[PDB]
Amino acid sequence: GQNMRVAFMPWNGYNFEDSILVSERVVQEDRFTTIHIQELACVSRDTKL
Amino acid sequence: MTPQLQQAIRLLQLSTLELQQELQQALESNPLLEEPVYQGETTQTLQDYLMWQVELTPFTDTDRAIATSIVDAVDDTGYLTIQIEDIVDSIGDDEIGLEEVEAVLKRIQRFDPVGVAAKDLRDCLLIQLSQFAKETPWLEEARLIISDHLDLLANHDFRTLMRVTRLKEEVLKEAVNLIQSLDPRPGQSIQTSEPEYVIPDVLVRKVSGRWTVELNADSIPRLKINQQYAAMGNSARNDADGQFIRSNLQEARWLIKSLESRNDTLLRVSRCIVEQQQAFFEQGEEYMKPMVLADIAQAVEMHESTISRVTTQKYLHSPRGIFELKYFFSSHVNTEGGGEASSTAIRALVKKLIAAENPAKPLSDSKLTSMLSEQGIMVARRTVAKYRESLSIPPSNQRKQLV
DNA sequence: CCAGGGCTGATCGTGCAAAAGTCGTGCCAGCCGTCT
C-alpha cells in the first residue's frame, strides 16, 4: 500500500462508525490509482455454408 | 450376389447419421443384440420489438388489431411478404377499405428501424429521405430519381440517365451518393444469428507434412452381443425358444462382423484418394489435378463400386479444411504441360483473376483465355465463359461503373 | 474301436455390367463501343 498521514478524530460525523475520511489532495496526487487491463476476444467460428 | 449380404455391403454407402438411425431401427428386433440449466434467456428482434412499439402508441382496438396483421407479415430478412390488398381481405370486413388500413400501415413506417415493413423497395428508400433534414443539398434531386428513372440507375449506364432527366454530371452524381448512403433492407438492422453446422469423420494425423488413415473417434455403433440373454440358449425350454435364440444369435454375429468390416474398409480407405491429390491441399485450391473413381480403384487395392460406396457421404476433416469425399470428383481438361487440369481449378482462377484486375476496365473471356495460355494451361474460351456464368459472376462489361 | 463316406450348418466371396451425369468444346444468336 502507501503511507498516509492520519488523525484519530470525529469530523462532522463523516467518520461516524468505520468510514475513512479522505482529503481531496489524495485524488489530486494520483495516489491509490490502479490500472485494470481487462481483455475480451471474438472468435471466427467458420460455418459449413 | 447375396441377400443377407447384398445390403450388408450397401449399408455403409450412407451417412453415419442414418447408419445410427437404422442400427437403432434393428437394435430392438434382436434381444440379444445390444449397444440444472433451464435459464434459456429470451430476446426481441423486429417481431417482438416491432410489437413492443405498437402498444406504446395510441392505436384503437380496430387499429391495434390491424397493426398486428401487418406487423406479423414482416419477413425478418427485410420487408413484408404479402401485398397490401391481402391484408384487407384477411381482416374479414367490407366496410373497411384500403384507406383505413393505409394509415395503420403508414404509421408503422416510422418506428425503430426507419424503413421497416416497406414493401416493393422504392417506398422504403423514399420514406427514409423523408425524415432527413430538408436543408440537404441533394434533397430534391434524389427524390426525383427515386419516384422514377430507377431502372436506368440500376443499369451499368448513367450518361443516358442524366441527359434525359435534366441532370448534370457533377451535382447529380453526388445525389447518387446520398441515395447510395441510404441502406436498403433496414429490416435486418435489428437482426443477428448464432449457428454452427459441422460434421466429423476421418481427421488428420499431421505427421511430417502428412495426414492419413488416423483413427476413428465416435462412429462405431457399440455392437456387443448380450451375455445375460445368451446364457439361456443352450438351456432352452422348447424347440421354439432354442430356434429363436440361435437365429437371432447368428444374425447378430452377422451384423457385428458386417459392422466391423465396414469400419476397416473406410478406415484405411482415407489415404489414397487424398494422396493421389497432394496439390489441392498443400499448394492450394488453385493447383488441382483431375481425379476419377475409375482411376482411384486402379491405384488402390480394390473394386470401383467398393470404393465409390465408402467414399460417398463421408465428410473428411483436416486442419486445412473439411470437404466431402464425393466432392473431390472432377472431370478432365487438356493442358499439355505434364498433367491435365479440372474445371473447378478454371473457376477458382477466373475468380482470383477477376479479384486482381483493374476495377474500371474489366477483365474478359478472350483475355482470360490468353492469360491462361501464358501460365501454360491452353483451355477453351467456352469453359471459362461457363465457369464464369456458373458462379453467378455478373458480366464484367456490365460490372463497370463510375470510377 | 477307428477311419471312410454321406448330411448338413457355417461361411464365405464385398463383385460387375448397365443407364445416366459431366464437361471439352464447337456452333450460333444477341448486344454494345466506335467511326464513319
Curated annotation (Swiss-Prot), chain A:
Briefly state the modifications made to the protein after translation.
Acetylated on several lysine residues in the presence of glucose.
Q: What is the applied biotechnology use of this protein, as the UniProt note states?
A: Co-administration of salinamide and rifampicin or salinamide and myxopyronin suppresses the emergence of resistance to both antibiotics.
The gene from which this protein is expressed is rpoB
Protein name per UniProt: DNA-directed RNA polymerase subunit beta
Task: Give the residue spans that cross the bilayer.
Answer: none
Family that this chain belongs to: Belongs to the RNA polymerase beta chain family.
Q: Which organism is it from?
A: Escherichia coli (strain K12)
**Subunit note:** The RNAP catalytic core consists of 2 alpha, 1 beta, 1 beta' and 1 omega subunit. When a sigma factor is associated with the core the holoenzyme is formed, which can initiate transcription. The rRNA transcription and antitermination complex (rrnTAC) consists of RNAP, NusA, NusB, NusE (rpsJ), NusG, SubB, ribosomal protein S4, DNA and precursor rRNA; S4 is more flexible than other subunits. In pull-down experiments interacts with CedA. (Microbial infection) Interacts (via flap domain) with Escherichia phage lambda antitermination protein Q; this interaction renders bacterial RNAP resistant to transcription pausing and allows it to read through termination signals.
Cystine pairings recorded for this chain: none
What function does this protein fulfil? DNA-dependent RNA polymerase (RNAP) catalyzes the transcription of DNA into RNA using the four ribonucleoside triphosphates as substrates.
